[PDB]
Amino acid sequence: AYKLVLIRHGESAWNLENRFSGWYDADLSPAGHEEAKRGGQALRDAGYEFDICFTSVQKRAIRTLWTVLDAIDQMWLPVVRTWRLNERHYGGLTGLNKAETAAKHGEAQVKIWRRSYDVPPPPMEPDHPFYSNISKDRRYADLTEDQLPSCESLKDTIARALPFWNEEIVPQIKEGKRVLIAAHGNSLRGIVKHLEGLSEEAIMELNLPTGIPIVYELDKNLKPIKPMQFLGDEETV
Amino acid sequence: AAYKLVLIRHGESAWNLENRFSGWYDADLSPAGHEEAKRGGQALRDAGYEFDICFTSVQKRAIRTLWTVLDAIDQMWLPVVRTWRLNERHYGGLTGLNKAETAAKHGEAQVKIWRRSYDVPPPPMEPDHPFYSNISKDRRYADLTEDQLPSCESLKDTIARALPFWNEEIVPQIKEGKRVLIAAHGNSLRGIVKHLEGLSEEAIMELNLPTGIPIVYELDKNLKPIKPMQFLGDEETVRK
Numbered sequence A: 001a002y003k004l005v006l007i008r009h010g011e012s013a014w015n016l017e018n019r020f021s022g023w024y025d026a027d028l029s030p031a032g033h034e035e036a037k038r039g040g041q042a043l044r045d046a047g048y049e050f051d052i053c054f055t056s057v058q059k060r061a062i063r064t065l066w067t068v069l070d071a072i073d074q075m076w077l078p079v080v081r082t083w084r085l086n087e088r089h090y091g092g093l094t095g096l097n098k099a100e101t102a103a104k105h106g107e108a109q110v111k112i113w114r115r116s117y118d119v120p121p122p123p124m125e126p127d128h129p130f131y132s133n134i135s136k137d138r139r140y141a142d143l144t145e146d147q148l149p150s151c152e153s154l155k156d157t158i159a160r161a162l163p164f165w166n167e168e169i170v171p172q173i174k175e176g177k178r179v180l181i182a183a184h185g186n187s188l189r190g191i192v193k194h195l196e197g198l199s200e201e202a203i204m205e206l207n208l209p210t211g212i213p214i215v216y217e218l219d220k221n222l223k224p225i226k227p228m229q230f231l232g233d234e235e236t237v
Numbered sequence B: 001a002a003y004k005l006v007l008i009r010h011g012e013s014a015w016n017l018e019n020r021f022s023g024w025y026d027a028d029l030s031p032a033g034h035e036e037a038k039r040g041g042q043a044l045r046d047a048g049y050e051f052d053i054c055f056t057s058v059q060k061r062a063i064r065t066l067w068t069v070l071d072a073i074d075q076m077w078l079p080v081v082r083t084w085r086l087n088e089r090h091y092g093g094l095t096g097l098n099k100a101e102t103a104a105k106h107g108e109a110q111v112k113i114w115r116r117s118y119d120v121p122p123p124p125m126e127p128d129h130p131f132y133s134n135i136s137k138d139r140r141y142a143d144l145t146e147d148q149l150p151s152c153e154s155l156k157d158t159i160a161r162a163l164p165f166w167n168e169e170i171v172p173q174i175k176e177g178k179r180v181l182i183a184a185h186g187n188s189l190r191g192i193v194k195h196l197e198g199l200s201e202e203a204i205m206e207l208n209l210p211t212g213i214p215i216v217y218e219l220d221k222n223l224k225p226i227k228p229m230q231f232l233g234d235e236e237t238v239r240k
């Protein structure tokens, strides 16, 4: 049975995980960093070994992966970064808290956006404070006009994450390489939905815990052989 | 110039503080060596350097130096390639001995020979060596052929196994236009510098790269330096 480990980063600075941090490159807060440290200790105590790591190009996930690699003394592992594992792009909502989002767009539209799998939020427009910060960021300079989102539905996010799973990660898993993925709520949602064949409604109901190793055991067809499991002490699991 | 290349040599390690030979032993930075890396990163940040790809070894004193630099210059998203071929020189059975144990066991004449010699290796690290399984059986070297895994290295050996990685992996990226950062070690960086500047054995053995300080090369399209290496940082640090 292949082993696959996912880890979702924890808290970012300035409450930005509650502010549609999205493609804004928020760093971990001190608390989010401690979360990653605890997740790494849990992987260390459990003696996990990896052969290759995948992460996004967003520093909060990269720093999570660094903290884990440090904790488990495997800083020498190959690391692969990809925009395709980025957090969902929340468009014009990026950086707003819940109250400000409702104030701007009204409760009705907010409910529609919260429940919809395929309706995107408004695009991030040139007058958004993150517009040039994200869209002109050098790490996206190789993306084509059609690949760099101004905004994403959950469908959009999963659609651009899954090609990287199939094209880069699955081959590593099938060679027997032990994969660690440090990424974001919605990109990990895409992977989990593919793994478990979950429904749109289902995946929108799933809220992956942060800072906690998520262990999958896959059969020869990369199908889970049991439910996802979490690593940690008794209280946190 | 056509190209710019930046090297950085990691700073003090935990085993440096013990004056022990580390070589392939995976010693971490001391707090001071970590601080050094932060200052070097800040120098790169103040100069506004941008990179497209980073190379380092599979040793954490170099990897953590790279990480610290990337953090400082807000380029943690860059691709990073790690290779055993940029590891520190392998000191064979000297690995893990401190200065006194080395002088005690081998005597003044022999230690002087090993220090000055380009191609006389120190004793090999034998299966009964206290760090033999820790290093030679470390799964990170699992894909090395038996010929590739050194039991010891002369400086010549270190340079000879570093330069294939330069030629085959770094040169292509440079000529592709990618701005390279190499975070590595004294002797593997010596291999690179010797090839870049066409230095004699004697000259490369006289060269001692400063630590924690960005070393900048301006290279023409044939990767020939168009001037001497430049250290980045305030006037003080550059002077020292």
Ligand SMILES: O=C(O)c1sc2c(Br)cc(Cl)cc2c1Nc1ccccc1
Pocket (backbone or CB within 6 Å): A093, A097, A098, A099, A101, A102, A109, A110, A111, A113, A114, A121
């Ligand atoms: O519960 C969640 O995780 C999500 S997702 C999402 C998206 Br897309 C757009 C919007 Cl306005 C909200 C949410 C949301 N909560 C929420 C935020 C503000 C006001 C009311 C509810």
Ligand SMILES: O=C(O)c1sc2c(Br)cc(Cl)cc2c1Nc1ccccc1
Pocket (backbone or CB within 6 Å): B099, B100, B102, B103, B104, B107, B108, B111, B112, B115
């Ligand atoms: O006196 C010298 O010139 C040198 S050179 C050198 C090197 Br190289 C490594 C080390 Cl451990 C010592 C020395 C050393 N002193 C010395 C050596 C053996 C016994 C007593 C003193």
Ligand SMILES: O=C(O)c1sc2c(Br)cc(Cl)cc2c1Nc1ccccc1
Pocket (backbone or CB within 6 Å): B091, B094, B099, B102, B110, B111, B112, B114, B115, B121, B122
């Ligand atoms: O300065 C250098 O590059 C080298 S290399 C080497 C080797 Br190999 C074996 C030995 Cl006994 C010494 C050295 C050496 N100097 C040195 C090492 C420890 C203490 C004092 C001086």
Ligand SMILES: [Cl-]
Pocket (backbone or CB within 6 Å): A079, B080
């Ligand atoms: Cl990395």
